[PDB]
């Protein structure tokens, strides 16, 4: 609440549970690596 | 206008009586809304 | 066929599987900031 | 990661019958299925494989037409429906999952067949059952005349276990089927679902 940004983008989608491990900066798999991957530089957050 | 990438719009409307060129007197342009567009603009157009 | 896989593999999501394979909705907040002006910000604190 | 069968049994010539092979501990629709065929005391004779039901489903050359695989991603079953069985097709059944979607750091039996179930035991012969008889002789016991293979043969019902030594059973002229187990015999036939303690 006290840092103010351009833009917000709100990626949603629906993976597997012992997948969501995998949409966190630097994973590799088959989420991250094939179908969403986030770089390392990442700023943002993820809500599963 | 373009500041800071903040794009300005001052506006008045006035009731006049005229047919060509500007009326005289003076009516300053109040601030009407301000658009955080933050990109370069160079030209534009009208609508009719 | 071999070697033709169709890319996309479905997910089994069935009720009765483990939190493991529960479909689990995530949403990825990616925060941009650049020179175009900071347009989204948090809710300004406002004291009495 | 275990793939079970079941239906294997007693089959006259000709007839017809339905292998189901439950798969758990993995996500079943990600790799595809086969079936292999092992003659008693021969090698493994590849029998049908499969990825997708809308896909193609590829089968040996010996078995095109008589046989028919499936499969059930709700279920994680694997179906194989022989019929019109013929007299060579006597064998050992395995459901073996063959992998072939590698992931990146992931490296797993792509395109290996990775993982063999226990395999069920199909006999194509119209020759009927027949109860075990245990034949007593290093103690031993004999297990003579007993239809079809398998039988589980133990000493002191798995109790005595070291030096228990269990050779393979012969095809004699009447057809029946003799082991010997060398050091109680337990003797348990499922087929005839018979369990002798001498």
């Known amino acids: 609440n006290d840092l103010c940004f351009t833009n917000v983008y709100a990626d949603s989608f629906v993976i597997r549970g012992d997948e969501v491990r995998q949409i966190a900066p630097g994973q590799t798999g088959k989420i991250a690596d094939y179908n969403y991957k986030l770089p390392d530089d990442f700023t943002g957050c993820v809500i599963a | 206008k373009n500041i800071d990438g903040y794009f300005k719009i001052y506006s008045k409307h006035t009731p006049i009586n005229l047919v060509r060129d500007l009326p005289q007197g003076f009516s300053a342009l109040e601030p009407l809304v301000d658009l955080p567009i933050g990109i370069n603009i160079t030209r534009f157009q009208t609508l009719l | 066929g071999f070697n033709c896989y169709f890319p996309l593999q479905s997910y089994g999501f069935q009720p009765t599987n483990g939190v493991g394979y529960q479909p689990y909705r995530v949403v990825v907040l990616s925060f941009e900031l650049l020179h175009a002006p900071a347009t989204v910000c948090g809710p300004k604190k406002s004291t009495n | 990661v275990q793939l079970l069968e079941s239906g294997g049994g007693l089959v006259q010539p000709g007839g017809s019958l339905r292998l189901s092979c439950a798969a758990s501990?993995?996500?079943?629709?990600?790799?595809?299925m086969s079936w292999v065929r092992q003659a008693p005391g021969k090698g493994l004779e590849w029998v049908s494989w499969?990825?997708?039901?809308?896909?193609?489903?590829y089968y040996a050359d010996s078995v095109k037409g008589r046989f028919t695989i499936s499969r059930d991603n709700s279920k994680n079953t694997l179906y194989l429906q022989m019929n019109s069985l013929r007299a060579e097709d006597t064998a050992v059944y395995y459901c073996?999952?063959?992998?072939?979607?590698?992931?990146?750091?992931?490296?797993?039996?792509?395109?290996?067949?990775?993982?063999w179930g226990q395999g069920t035991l199909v006999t194509v012969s119209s020759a009927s059952t027949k109860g075990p008889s245990v034949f007593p002789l290093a103690l031993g016991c004999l297990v003579k005349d007993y239809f079809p293979e398998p039988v589980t043969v133990s000493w002191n019902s798995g109790a005595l276990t070291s030096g228990v030594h269990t050779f393979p059973a012969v095809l004699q002229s009447s057809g029946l089927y003799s082991l010997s187990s060398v050091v109680t015999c337990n003797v348990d036939h499922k087929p005839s679902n018979t369990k002798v303690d001498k």
């Open positions: 073996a999952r063959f992998p072939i979607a590698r992931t990146s750091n992931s490296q797993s039996s792509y395109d290996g067949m990775d993982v």
């Open positions: 501990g993995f996500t079943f629709s990600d790799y595809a």
């Open positions: 499969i990825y997708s039901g809308s896909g193609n489903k």
